[PDB]
Amino acid sequence: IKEMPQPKTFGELKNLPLLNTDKPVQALMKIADELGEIFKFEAPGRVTCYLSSQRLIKEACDESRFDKNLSQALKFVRDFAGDGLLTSWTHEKNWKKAHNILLPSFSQQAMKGYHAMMVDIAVQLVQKWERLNADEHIEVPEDMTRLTLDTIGLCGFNYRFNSFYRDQPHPFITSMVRALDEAMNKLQRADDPAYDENKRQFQEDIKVMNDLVDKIIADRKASGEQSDDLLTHMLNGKDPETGEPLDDENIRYQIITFLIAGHESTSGLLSFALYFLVKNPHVLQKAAEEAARVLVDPVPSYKQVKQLKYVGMVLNEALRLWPTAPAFSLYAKEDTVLGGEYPLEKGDELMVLIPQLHRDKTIWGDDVEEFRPERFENPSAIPQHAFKPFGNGQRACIGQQFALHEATLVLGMMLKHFDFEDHTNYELDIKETQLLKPEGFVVKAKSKKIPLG
């Protein structure tokens, strides 16, 4: 029945120059504000359409009709994350095999085994802030990223990146960041010899990542040690379907994937949650009151983290306004009609624009830009597929429980131990890589002088 709107075009380049910008997701959100719930986005060689309403995304989330697509962004990241969970297609044998093997390591129950390692890193964060001098401040996303990288290293392969001991990045990290950057940069360009150097550097970075991870795996098998880490489960697990274990090359890709998937996504969430708390002091007060009520011991237990309900609402309200992995891609499994109005062909692509979904006034009411964690008080009232910050169905985030347990523990501890001051009246500036984060967000903390165990 209807023709899809489309944003402004640039002759032969179609819509491509619209993503030639430091902040493409935020540019796409303004397009959606103008064009509405669905728009066609064309590039040379390719077309996708971006969805922004709960009414159409609830249909895109029908797994009988649509499966996960590798967006052009993920295709580029697949050049180094290979067939790990995030960059594999659903129909590749290593997807279902690794998904079956790793699901038991990522459940709510499994979080009891990672809890003590998470605490070890959260205590390092608290001690860093306790030890600042009166005149100093905190570089919020920088310190969040030290906690989240350390927590994934320790829980994922018993490796200490010791990020609180340094300001220079780990070699793996240098190459990872630079490969992510190149993958991001390729979205925009239009094979010229001007890129011979980008190409050589990318190859060099892929080799550094593979060499360093292949050695962690070799070391582990050579030593025989059993930890409560992901690497142990991968080396010992068998997929109950095929009966097969993962091989070493696939294990290497799962480890690279954990670092690409489970680190800056969670540090972004912690940084946005802090930003909203300091911009909303009544919400900060209510969250700090819960942390004081619940965290009655020198360090938090697993069960006490589960009891930080309001802190959990705070994190979901940050994920509502700024989901840190802001889009995911799908393809039509068969010809079908979306919303009774937009016929799609088998293989056609869709993009779910999560921050715009989360602004659907028909779901959230008119106060959609307000930070109000109490929206999440009776979650059964939320319609299906309205709130999707960890994606969809069997291709949802396998790390969801991990990220929320880490973020709830850390933000609980921060709220127990410090008062916070937005001393610069910081203006939100969201920096975009594949993921979102507040850039330049700084605060001052004033210790409540409560001892740690």
Q: Out of 16, 173, 260, 308, which residue is the one contacting ligand SRO (CB under 6 A)?
A: 260
397 binds ligand HEM (CB under 6 A): yes
237 interface partner picked from ligand HEM, ligand SRO, none, CB below 5 to 8 A per type:
none
Distance CA 231, CA 105 (A): 10
397 binds ligand SRO (CB under 6 A): yes
Instruction: Decide if 450 contacts 416 (C-beta within 8 A).
Output: yes
254 binds ligand SRO (CB under 6 A): no
* Strand (E) or helix (H) holding 119: helix 111-130
Who contacts 87 (Cβ-Cβ below 8 Å, separation ≥6)?
70, 74, 75, 77, 78, 81, 253, 257
∠ CA 74-80-85, nearest 5°, is 60
Q: Which of residues 114-143 bind ligand SRO (CB under 6 A)?
A: none
DSSP per residue, 283-344 = HHHHHHHHHHHH--SSS--HHHHHT-HHHHHHHHHHHHH--SS-EEEEEESS-EEETTTEEE
- In angstroms, what is the minimal distance from the CB of 33 to ligand SRO? 23
Residue number with CB closer to ligand SRO (174 or 285): 174
Distance CA 181, CA 184 (A): 5
Q: Out of 387, 402, 418, 420, which residue is the one contacting ligand HEM (CB under 6 A)?
A: 402
Residue number with CB closer to ligand SRO (397 or 445): 397
Distance CA 70, CA 211 (A): 26
319 binds ligand SRO (CB under 6 A): no
Q: Determine whether the annotation assigns residue 49 to a binding site.
A: no
Q: Out of 15, 53, 69, 265, which residue is the one contacting ligand SRO (CB under 6 A)?
A: 265
Q: Out of 49, 122, 261, 288, which residue is the one contacting ligand SRO (CB under 6 A)?
A: 261
Q: Out of 111, 147, 325, 436, which residue is the one contacting ligand HEM (CB under 6 A)?
A: 325
Residue number with CB closer to ligand HEM (253 or 418): 253
Return the exposure string of 209-222: e unless at least 16 CB atoms fall within 10 Å of the residue's CB, then b: bbebbeebbeebee
Nearest residue to ligand HEM, using CB?
399
The residue count for binding ligand HEM (CB under 6 A) is 25
Q: Which of residues 267-296 bind ligand HEM (CB under 6 A)?
A: 269
Q: Out of 250, 280, 324, 434, which residue is the one contacting ligand HEM (CB under 6 A)?
A: 324
Cα dist from 36 to 4, 356, 357, whole Å = 10, 10, 11
Distance CA 379, CA 194 (A): 52
Q: Show the tokens assigned to 105.
A: 């390591």
Q: Determine whether the annotation assigns residue 302 to a binding site.
A: no
Q: x/- site string to ligand HEM, residues 85 to 124, per CB under 6 A? A: xx------------x-------------------------
Residues annotated as binding site for (9Z)-hexadecenoate? 50
Task: Give the residues lining the site for ligand SRO (CB under 6 A).
Answer: 73-74, 77, 180, 260-261, 265, 325, 397, 399, 434-435
